[PDB]
Short mmCIF file of C-alpha atoms in Angstrom, two decimals:
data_model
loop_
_atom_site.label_atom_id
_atom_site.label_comp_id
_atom_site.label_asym_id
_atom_site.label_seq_id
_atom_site.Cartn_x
_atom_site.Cartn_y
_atom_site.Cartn_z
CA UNK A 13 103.23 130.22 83.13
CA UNK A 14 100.67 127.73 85.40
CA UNK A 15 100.94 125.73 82.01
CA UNK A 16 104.36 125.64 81.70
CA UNK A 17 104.58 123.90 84.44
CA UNK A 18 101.31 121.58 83.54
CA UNK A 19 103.88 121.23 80.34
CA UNK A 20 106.48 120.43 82.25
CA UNK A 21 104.98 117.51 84.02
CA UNK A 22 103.42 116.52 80.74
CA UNK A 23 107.00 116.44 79.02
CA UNK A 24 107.64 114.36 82.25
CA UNK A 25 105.04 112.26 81.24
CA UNK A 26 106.55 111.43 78.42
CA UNK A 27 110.21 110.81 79.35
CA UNK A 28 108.61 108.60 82.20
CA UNK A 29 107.24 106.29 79.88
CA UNK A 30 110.43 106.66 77.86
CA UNK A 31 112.15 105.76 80.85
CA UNK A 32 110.12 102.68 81.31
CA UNK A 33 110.93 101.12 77.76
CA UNK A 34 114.47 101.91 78.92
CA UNK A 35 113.62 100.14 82.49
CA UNK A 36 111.62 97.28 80.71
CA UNK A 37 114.91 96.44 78.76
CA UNK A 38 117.19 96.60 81.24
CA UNK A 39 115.09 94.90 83.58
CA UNK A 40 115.02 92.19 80.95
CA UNK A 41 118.50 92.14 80.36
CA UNK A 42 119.26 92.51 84.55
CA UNK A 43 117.26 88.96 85.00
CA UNK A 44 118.86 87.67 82.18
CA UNK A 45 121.99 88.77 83.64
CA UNK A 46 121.72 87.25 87.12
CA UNK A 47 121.82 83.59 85.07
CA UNK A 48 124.59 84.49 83.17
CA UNK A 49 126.57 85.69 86.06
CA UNK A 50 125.05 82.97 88.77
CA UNK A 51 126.47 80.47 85.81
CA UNK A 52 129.50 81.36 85.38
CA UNK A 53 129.84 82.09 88.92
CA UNK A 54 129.24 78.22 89.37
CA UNK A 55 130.89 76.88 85.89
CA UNK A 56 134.00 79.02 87.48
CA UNK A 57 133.90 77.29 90.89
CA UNK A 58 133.68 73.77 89.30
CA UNK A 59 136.69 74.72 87.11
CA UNK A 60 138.45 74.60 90.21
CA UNK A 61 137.17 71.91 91.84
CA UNK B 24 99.27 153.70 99.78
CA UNK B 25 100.48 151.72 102.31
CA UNK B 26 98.35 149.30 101.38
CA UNK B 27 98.71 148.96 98.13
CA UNK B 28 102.89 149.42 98.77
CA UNK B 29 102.63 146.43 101.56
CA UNK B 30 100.29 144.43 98.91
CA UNK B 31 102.46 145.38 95.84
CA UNK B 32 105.53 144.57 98.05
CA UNK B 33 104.17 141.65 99.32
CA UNK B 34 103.17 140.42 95.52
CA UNK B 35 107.08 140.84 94.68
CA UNK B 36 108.03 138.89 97.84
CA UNK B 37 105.23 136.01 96.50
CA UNK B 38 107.53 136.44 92.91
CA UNK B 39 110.94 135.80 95.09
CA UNK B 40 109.12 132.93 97.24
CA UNK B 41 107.79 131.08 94.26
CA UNK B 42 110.94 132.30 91.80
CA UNK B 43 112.37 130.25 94.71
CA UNK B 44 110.28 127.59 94.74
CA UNK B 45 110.74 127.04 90.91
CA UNK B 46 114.46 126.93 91.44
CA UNK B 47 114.81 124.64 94.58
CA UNK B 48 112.71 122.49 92.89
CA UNK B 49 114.41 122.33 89.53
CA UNK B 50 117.40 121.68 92.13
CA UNK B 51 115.60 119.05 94.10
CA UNK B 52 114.33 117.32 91.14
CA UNK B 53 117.81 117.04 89.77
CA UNK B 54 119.27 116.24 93.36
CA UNK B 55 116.34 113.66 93.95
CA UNK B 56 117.13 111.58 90.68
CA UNK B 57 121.18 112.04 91.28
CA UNK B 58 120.85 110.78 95.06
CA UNK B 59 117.95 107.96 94.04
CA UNK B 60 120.18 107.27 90.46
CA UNK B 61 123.84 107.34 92.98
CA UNK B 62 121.82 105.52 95.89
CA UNK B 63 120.88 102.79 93.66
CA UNK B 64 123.98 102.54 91.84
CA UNK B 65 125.74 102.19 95.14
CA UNK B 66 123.86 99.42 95.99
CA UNK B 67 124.52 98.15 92.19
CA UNK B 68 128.49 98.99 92.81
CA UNK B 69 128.89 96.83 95.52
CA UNK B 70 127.58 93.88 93.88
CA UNK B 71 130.19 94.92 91.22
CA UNK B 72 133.15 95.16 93.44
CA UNK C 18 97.15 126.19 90.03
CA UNK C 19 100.62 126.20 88.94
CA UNK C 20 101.79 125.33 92.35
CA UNK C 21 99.63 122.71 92.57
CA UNK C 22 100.41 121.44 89.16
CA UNK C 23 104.09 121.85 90.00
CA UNK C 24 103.15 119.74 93.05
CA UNK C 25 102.46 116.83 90.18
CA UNK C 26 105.74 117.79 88.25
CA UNK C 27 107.34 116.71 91.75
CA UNK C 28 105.45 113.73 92.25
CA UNK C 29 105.86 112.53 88.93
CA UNK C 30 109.44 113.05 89.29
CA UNK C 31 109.51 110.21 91.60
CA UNK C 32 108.33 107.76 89.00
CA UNK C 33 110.68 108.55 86.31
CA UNK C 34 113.20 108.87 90.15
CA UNK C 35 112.27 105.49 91.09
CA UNK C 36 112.53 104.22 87.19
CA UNK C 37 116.30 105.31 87.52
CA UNK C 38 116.49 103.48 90.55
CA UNK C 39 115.53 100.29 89.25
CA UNK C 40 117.11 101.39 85.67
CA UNK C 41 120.44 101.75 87.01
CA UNK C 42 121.19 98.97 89.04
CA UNK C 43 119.53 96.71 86.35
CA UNK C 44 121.97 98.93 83.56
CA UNK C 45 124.83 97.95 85.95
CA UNK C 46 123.68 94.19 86.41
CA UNK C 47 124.54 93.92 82.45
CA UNK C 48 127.92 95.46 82.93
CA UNK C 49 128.80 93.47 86.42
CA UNK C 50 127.29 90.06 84.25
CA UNK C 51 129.33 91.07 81.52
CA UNK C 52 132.58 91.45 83.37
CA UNK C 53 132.24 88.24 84.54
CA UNK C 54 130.32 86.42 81.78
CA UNK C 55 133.51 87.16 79.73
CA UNK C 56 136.13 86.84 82.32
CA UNK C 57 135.19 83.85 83.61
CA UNK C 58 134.32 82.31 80.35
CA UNK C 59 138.14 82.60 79.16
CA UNK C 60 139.29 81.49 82.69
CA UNK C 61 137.20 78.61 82.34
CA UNK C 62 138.21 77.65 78.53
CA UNK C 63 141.66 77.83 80.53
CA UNK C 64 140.96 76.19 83.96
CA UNK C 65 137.76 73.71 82.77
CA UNK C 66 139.31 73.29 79.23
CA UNK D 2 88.71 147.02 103.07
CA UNK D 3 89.52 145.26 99.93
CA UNK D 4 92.81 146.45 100.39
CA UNK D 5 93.53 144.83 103.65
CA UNK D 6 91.88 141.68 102.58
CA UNK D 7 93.47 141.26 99.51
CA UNK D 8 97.13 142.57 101.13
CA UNK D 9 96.36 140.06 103.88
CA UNK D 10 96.29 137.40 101.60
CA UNK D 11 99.65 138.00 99.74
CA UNK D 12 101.07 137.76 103.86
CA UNK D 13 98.71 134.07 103.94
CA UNK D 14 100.57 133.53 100.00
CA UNK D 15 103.81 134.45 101.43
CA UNK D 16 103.52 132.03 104.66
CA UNK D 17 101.95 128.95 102.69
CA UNK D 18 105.31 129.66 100.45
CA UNK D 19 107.25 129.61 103.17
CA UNK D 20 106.38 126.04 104.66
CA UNK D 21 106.53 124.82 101.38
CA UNK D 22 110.37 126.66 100.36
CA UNK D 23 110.87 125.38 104.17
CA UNK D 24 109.94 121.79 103.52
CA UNK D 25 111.45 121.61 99.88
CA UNK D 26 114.70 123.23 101.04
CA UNK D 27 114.61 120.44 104.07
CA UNK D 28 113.80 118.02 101.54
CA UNK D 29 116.42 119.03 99.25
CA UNK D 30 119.23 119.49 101.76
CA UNK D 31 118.44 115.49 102.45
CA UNK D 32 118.89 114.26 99.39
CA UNK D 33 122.11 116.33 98.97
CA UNK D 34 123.69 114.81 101.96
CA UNK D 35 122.43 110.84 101.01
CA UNK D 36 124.14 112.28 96.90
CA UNK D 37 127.17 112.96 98.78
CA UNK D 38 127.48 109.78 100.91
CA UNK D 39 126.28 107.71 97.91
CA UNK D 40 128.81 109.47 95.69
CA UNK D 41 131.89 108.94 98.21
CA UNK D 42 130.68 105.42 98.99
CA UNK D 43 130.18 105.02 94.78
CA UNK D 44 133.94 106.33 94.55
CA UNK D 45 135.62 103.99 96.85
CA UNK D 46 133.63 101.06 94.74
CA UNK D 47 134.79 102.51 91.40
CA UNK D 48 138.67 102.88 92.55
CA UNK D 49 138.27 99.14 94.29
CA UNK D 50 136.92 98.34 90.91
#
């Protein structure tokens, strides 16, 4: 069973890197989202002004 | 005898403790990522509302 | 050795823990940039245009 | 002799288990109680939403 549990935290392993392409792309899409939102949080504000 | 009862009854307590162990860590691994995964969507939900 | 090597299952956990973290609040930034990159850019066709 | 000593060591098995179920359980109980705030806090957000 001791490798089970090596297993497990080598199964980890490889959901943590999974989770890392997952991170990567919503860390990519998160910066690219603080623009759009920052923009149209301005383009909104001069609509009113 | 009473050795070998205490040690074989201490071996089944060592099954319970790390039986235990096993399960409050599946639990706390779980319960770690929820409160991390709700603690930083919190902090994520705010900015939303 | 399997505690210990569940001791690196738990540690681990953190990573792919602290990958949701991050994960999830940059997940939600594309839903709380959404919201607004859409809401705002029909206001703003309305207001601004 | 080898009796004691090894039935002595499932008692020195049993207490190193117990700091650690004592110090996981701790642990756990924790990050239950920051789940639950960050889940009632999360709700509040979500309804506001």
């Amino acid at each position: 069973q001791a490798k089970e549990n090596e297993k497990k935290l080598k199964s980890m392993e490889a959901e943590m890197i999974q989770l890392q392409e997952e991170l990567a792309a919503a860390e990519r899409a998160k910066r690219q989202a603080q623009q759009e939102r920052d923009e149209l949080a301005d383009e909104i504000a001069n609509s009113s002004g | 005898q009473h050795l070998q009862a205490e040690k074989k009854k201490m071996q089944q307590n060592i099954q319970e403790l790390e039986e235990q162990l096993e399960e409050e860590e599946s639990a706390r691994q779980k319960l770690q990522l929820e409160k991390v995964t709700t603690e930083a969507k919190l902090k994520k939900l705010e900015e939303e509302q």
